[PDB]
Design a protein around this nucleic acid. Sequence first.
RNA 1: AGUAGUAACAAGAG
RNA 2: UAUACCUCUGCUUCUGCUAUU
RNA 3: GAAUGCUAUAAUAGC
Lengths: 733, 747, 487
Amino acid sequence: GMTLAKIELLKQLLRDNEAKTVLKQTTVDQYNIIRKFNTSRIEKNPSLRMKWAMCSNFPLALTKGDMANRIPLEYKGIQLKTNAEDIGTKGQMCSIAAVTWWNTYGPIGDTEGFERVYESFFLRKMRLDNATWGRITFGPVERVRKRVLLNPLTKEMPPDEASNVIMEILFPKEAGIPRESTWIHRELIKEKREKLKGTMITPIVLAYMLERELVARRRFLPVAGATSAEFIEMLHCLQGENWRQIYHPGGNKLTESRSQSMIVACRKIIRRSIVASNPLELAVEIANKTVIDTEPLKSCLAAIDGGDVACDIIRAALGLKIRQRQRFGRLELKRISGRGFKNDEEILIGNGTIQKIGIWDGEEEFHVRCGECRGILKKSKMKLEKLLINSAKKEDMRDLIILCMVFSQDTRMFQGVRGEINFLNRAGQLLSPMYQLQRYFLNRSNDLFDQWGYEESPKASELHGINESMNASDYTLKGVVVTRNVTEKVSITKNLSLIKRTGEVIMGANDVSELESQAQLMITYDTPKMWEMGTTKELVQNTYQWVLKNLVTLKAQFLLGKEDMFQWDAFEAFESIIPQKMAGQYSGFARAVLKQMRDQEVMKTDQFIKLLPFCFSPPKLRSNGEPYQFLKLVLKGGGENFIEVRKGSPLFSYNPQTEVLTICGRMMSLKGKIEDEERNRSMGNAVLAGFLVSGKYDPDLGDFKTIEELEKLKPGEKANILLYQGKPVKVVK
Amino acid sequence: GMNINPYFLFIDVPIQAAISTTFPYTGVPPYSHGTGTGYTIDTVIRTHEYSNKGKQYISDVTGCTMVDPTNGPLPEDNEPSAYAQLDCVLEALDRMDEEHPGLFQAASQNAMETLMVTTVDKLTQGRQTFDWTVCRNQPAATALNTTITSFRLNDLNGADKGGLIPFCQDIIDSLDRPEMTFFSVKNIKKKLPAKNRKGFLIKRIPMKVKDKITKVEYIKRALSLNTMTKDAERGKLKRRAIATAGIQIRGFVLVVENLAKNICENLEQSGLPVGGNEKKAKLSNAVAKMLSNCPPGGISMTVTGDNTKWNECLNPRIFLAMTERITRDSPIWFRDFCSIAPVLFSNKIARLGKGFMITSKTKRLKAQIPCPDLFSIPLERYNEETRAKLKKLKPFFNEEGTASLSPGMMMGMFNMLSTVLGVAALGIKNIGNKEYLWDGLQSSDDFALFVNAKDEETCMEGINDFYRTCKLLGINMSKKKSYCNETGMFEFTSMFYRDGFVSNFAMELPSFGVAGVNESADMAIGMTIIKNNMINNGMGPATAQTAIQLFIADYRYTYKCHRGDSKVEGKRMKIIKELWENTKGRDGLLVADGGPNIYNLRNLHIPEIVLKYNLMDPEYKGRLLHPQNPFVGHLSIKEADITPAHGPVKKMDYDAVSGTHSWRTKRNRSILNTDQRNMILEEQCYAKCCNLFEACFNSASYRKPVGQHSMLEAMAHRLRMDARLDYESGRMSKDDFEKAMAHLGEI
Amino acid sequence: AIERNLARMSPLVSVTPKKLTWEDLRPIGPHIYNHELPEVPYNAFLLMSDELGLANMTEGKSKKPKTLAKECLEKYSTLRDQTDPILIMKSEKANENFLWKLWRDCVNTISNEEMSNELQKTNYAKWATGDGLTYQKIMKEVAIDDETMCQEEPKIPNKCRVAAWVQTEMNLLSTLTSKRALDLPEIGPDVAPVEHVGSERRKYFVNEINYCKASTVMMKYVLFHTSLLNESNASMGKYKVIPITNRVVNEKGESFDMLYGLAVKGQSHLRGDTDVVTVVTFEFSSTDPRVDSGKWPKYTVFRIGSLFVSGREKSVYLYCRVNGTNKIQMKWGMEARRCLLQSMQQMEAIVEQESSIQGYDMTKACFKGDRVNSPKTFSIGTQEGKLVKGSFGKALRVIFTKCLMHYVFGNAQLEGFSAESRRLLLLIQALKDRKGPWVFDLEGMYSGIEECISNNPWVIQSAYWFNEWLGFEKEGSKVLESVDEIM
RNA sequence: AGUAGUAACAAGAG
RNA sequence: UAUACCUCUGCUUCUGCUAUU
RNA sequence: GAAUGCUAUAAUAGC
Ligand SMILES: [Mg+2]
């Protein structure tokens, strides 16, 4: 009977004519303005004000209540609280000693349901507690700044949807209009309502505690091969720029996160195996020692029913039933017939801009599925042909059509893009156009249906068409039909191609996606030289480090045998981060320059170190015998992943003053490992192949020659070269 | 002997790699003393010093001395110039619109659709705002309330509709009112009967008297900006002036910024609004592309850039042009709505702060001369510096103690929109089809121009051009602070790039201190700051582990809560030591209860109360987490008259459990001496009305309640139902129900 | 329009760019070398390298600050008793008699058997704490009528020259001691290898600092500024004797209470954060102020006896200074511990960097050296014109010291210098990187740096050290002049 | 005095 | 003037905008 | 094989 007291208090409050007029005039909206009304100025230096205020006699304010009066005025000659009442709480003020007293001899209240209220946090601890710690590793880590989830959620919803759920749990009467959401989480609502039922914690706390484990805390962080929230929460202990810590959390890990990581592992294995002779040899070697979190890759590929080309290639390589089951987020396909050729093309979209997308050629048939609904899809290069489906759920049917329309990459689908569609992220990062178009049309479907066009429904036995509203209609969507009706032993080539028992291929290493991405769970390669599956900068730094480590021998062995120490297992790894279409050309150039340093006496140890790794890929010279000439050697990844031939670069630069070689920001001393003559010995000689310095810039020869103009000379012709700003050199063939 | 030189580290380590050692953030930041009128007047003089060659006229609205540099004579020298050429500002924006097709209308749309949803309470989240009723700064939430209460008296109830637009309509209507009325409390004595000798007691009561002001006096107050000095301004010798704006003009600025934000978010070179890792990512990506795009044989050069007199030079009328050009496709009402904010700023008035203090050393007397009485004393009685300042102020001065200030943005009012005008300069890229190509980044005044050209002599021709291009937008590049080098290393917003943005631990060191919220919070914040630094600011595990120790000391000294087994004497320590002896599970005690610190790298992210809960004594936790403890202040669960001035419970980032250590400090009672006393009653009234409303609607604490109907109407209906259903269910009796319906009947 | 306006604009408007050359980089703040200016005087709150703590071995468990300060003098009674003022140095506008009377009042009050450390408001104590020296507020109406009442000419920081004592501080604060001061509390048990690496790594870093002079000074500065703030609020309207105390542990592992002197705190009705409270410092020292007289113009010194510093009977002086502090400075004093982090991090960066190159934990390697790698050495300082190499542990401590001096001499003069010089440091690093830097108005750049160099000791010494290093780098550059030059 | 440093505090108020 | 060797006060002696959220 | 966009009383950055 709290009702009576409120009505009684309202009559008390309404006797104050100043209060009356506030209640009469101030609207429910304006409550939000008068709630924040205060005298208090915002404390700009709270750190100080606290440090100071803690030296005062009564810095805290109690709430005027029977409990406040259970604190005594003094304890063993300690003034615990004063009679003076705070302006704010309108209750007695007290010393910090009051808290300490209460915590020691205070009344013992009931803490029932506390753990159920603060479950979110207890799980956070349970994960750390039931975790297992591996080894720390010292070496370069390329951290990438990505928008990640900070805290595991019970169930993810938009703040709007999430807010409406909490209302149903805590404040039923003051919920407002019943939304669809109300039904969708009826299990969660009831579950939480039953769990928080017999608690004495303040509803406002319970409200934020649920918000904490329903609303997503998603922020940019520097991560490296760990994205799963239960990893991100520990991110501080997982790695730094120059070290890494293996950590297996507790509780449970999702099959979806297990999947998306399991792909990255396989892609990373294949991307590296490609470069070696007998790729299948290495592919098997690594895959048998690849662990995803605590689970071996082989067990993971066996357990999970899904994953891309790469997963199937490795499955075959290990000897497991290859599942040709694909996923497009909500859509899940299984190929019956066809062969897809992903070619990058410039697509015009409805709003009127040009987006670069990978478009698949060939007629292909798949078993499309979406929840309870099932179907068969037939598509060709940017055209959906035919789509058969079952009549399951009205929304699961509606989604499958939209998903299948987008998946097909139909020119009609791109025409129906009217509104703001972001392919590029706020931080200028790429978002998967096909996966953004999927996400866009799932919300705004009426535009796609109208922009597609209708026709006559089928008049067959069990075939009857459906319209926009998803009802048995006369007009159906152009090539959509509804029905009443719902492997083979492969072998894998050492060069990684899946051949049928006939001879036709189904997959190859050339069919896997080139996009490297952050694994959801932590990938570990239990083989020595795990660095080989690293990033560009990691591989680059680890290679040159290995060159510097063995420089003593490697430099001597070169002055004896020519091509003996070009084939090295480190330089193989290093190849897998070179563009394959320039790998050969670079080796052609590097070897020529290296031999040119040996044979003509004009050595340069910094240059030797820089180029030696590029001398692995079988050489690719021009048609006229002479090697290709270069200013810079671009590598896989960002526009700063390149090695300059004449200058230094963000990956590699040598300071002769200090004799300090810088490799991705890490400094290494070449003191001792350097000849006496080199200091004065020019670089101009080890900059072009079959080109050596004669004198200094000769104005008669004119401006500095380009790579092309240099390549298109005849032996014994002089030329003006610029190594770096303010070092003109005169070089001859 | 042997003479140590700390600069000799830079021989072994490059400056960027050890930049941290160049930031003295263990040291005290510079704070202001006394008046800011000197610093304020300087701005007012300088703003006009850069516009003096422009068109000078008298405002027939305010009567103020207006100066207009726009479309003015181009500069003859490199002294800061405000003489921006409209045509050049437009051309720059047209190129930007061509490079970013539909962006302007795309933003304008979202900015407009937002405004339609935006409520009035939006204005109650802006720190200290200038209140025109009392002509003093006040909390945003109060400054608004005083404007809504005052508007009602002038027959302006647009506020009540709840949307921002109809409230804004009332603000530009209030300028048309011949006189503006507003409440101003006066004290009144009243005899009250008491257990007293004389048999009574006199006590002063507040009484809302209706004050009036003229059309002009009000307009000037609407266009008024209050001025301070910037305290804790790091890495600067001499102080600078800052300005707070009126609740009138705050409304219209929100939309013009919200517009510019939408534009900036979808620009390649915008440093705003992106921040921290998002910004580092964007700039890291931007540098990489503009680096690799450099022509072979050519030279890529990065100009580490800063702009001088950014506020003093940037003109409102140019910002007006920008809104007009950006909203071109928007409906006529929204084109006008945006136009207001720059219009107010082009007629704005700068308040000169406290004034100047005059003293006699012989007599040992001091007196504050208020700004209105600045020219009350002969200028020989002011010091050399101030004399000149006042002489140069003379022709921009208003007798009420204010300064006309038509030119200039004022400190940081249109950051987003200035960033756009900046980017717009970077959008040109080339002039006269010369052998160079510029492209940069812009975050307010701070900019990093990249120039790819054939030789560094050509690069300079490009920079020299960019410089001259900016001069036409009123953007003056700092020749003293700006510097140029070959691309590979640069500085942008105290982020130091050297083949990748380097770690600068020193900058965020101050955040490692005891935050000063309270015990339960400061622990969480304390550990969360370390955790977050280990990630972002590259703090190694040893330094991270030390950063715990150092915190846990500062905490124990600050909250006077040393280990129970320590022999540190103190008032709290006496009971802390008794708790230590009384308690069995001592590892279960929180640090604040003289407990032992159990934090390390791995558990930084767990609440202390949750870490120790398992190994607490039941009696100890039973106290520590008492549901109705008096330190935090919960609900009644009983209904006497429990109505304190409880502010709205916020949603802070730090994760900590609500227990006895989650207390609040007593309010600064300096107010009890001054006549401002009155406001405590006004507060403790609203408090009563809200606190009760929250007892009727529990969801009000969590989510903002919506309705243009009366609070009383809402409360009445709810209680009426509550009573009926309480009766019909059987929670309430007939005798009680009769009383319920009888009492509710009286309303 | 842009083309049209740029076409018609005066050629006088330009960035006027010039390519930077070493020779263009002249020395910053040449006035600091002008011998006509005064030597910058010691203006710190407490003594540092000139400090002298009276050692008093404790039971190990603490007591009241009066009780320890008493028992500390009880041991060194010969000093505590010395009642005859043997004046050596006097501060221009000081009062020998009053200051000595005050010292004696402190010693007596702290030595007595009473609970309180309160001081009677004597004629001397009042002069010392600046009783009623504030001007009287009057009406602007009355103020305007008075012609003799005027706005005062702002007092400016005067220009000073370089002072050896600043160099000598760094040098001595950098050096190792037998004594550990730091009060670093407990940590949770280690589990994750990262924590085991951190913990072991600390043993090298923390100790190297804990066993150096700079540390003790910092800890003293903190622990004082704590009790000073605690009093300032608690005993607002009382003159109070606060002892300058500090706990220290020797290599043998024995706790010693260290009394460095006595301070008196004037009335502290501190409303504003900037509002000042007069603190009068009486500090023990072995330093003869007659040696470097230009260092101590702010100090009044009394010879108060002698002590065995080892086999040597060193005379003990008493440095008396009327000083001042405010809420902010006191607060930032309690947060001076964070000098550890700024110094520690910067080197842990080097250890972690070097660790990635070698592939193991290079912590132990960098300090001492291992089987593979010889110890890390840094260009540390100079010795009759020639560069000197020093330890990783030294290079660490030299930063920790710098970070302490950043606090101790932390004002707006430093902030401005640090920020503006950082701009020139980067222009140098460019020349070093051979990134061919350009400048637009170098003089303007310099003036901004040089206007900050006034009376701050650390700023004046930093300008000397900068100018010194610049000259060394300018020499180093020569090596690069003739590289890939053919000849 | 001193702190400090372009202007203040060295208590303010009934 | 008086109460007043009393009483009250220690960011309220004007602390802004935009981002990291 | 991608996303999910926000919105503190601290601190930093620029004005
Ligand atoms: Mg600037």
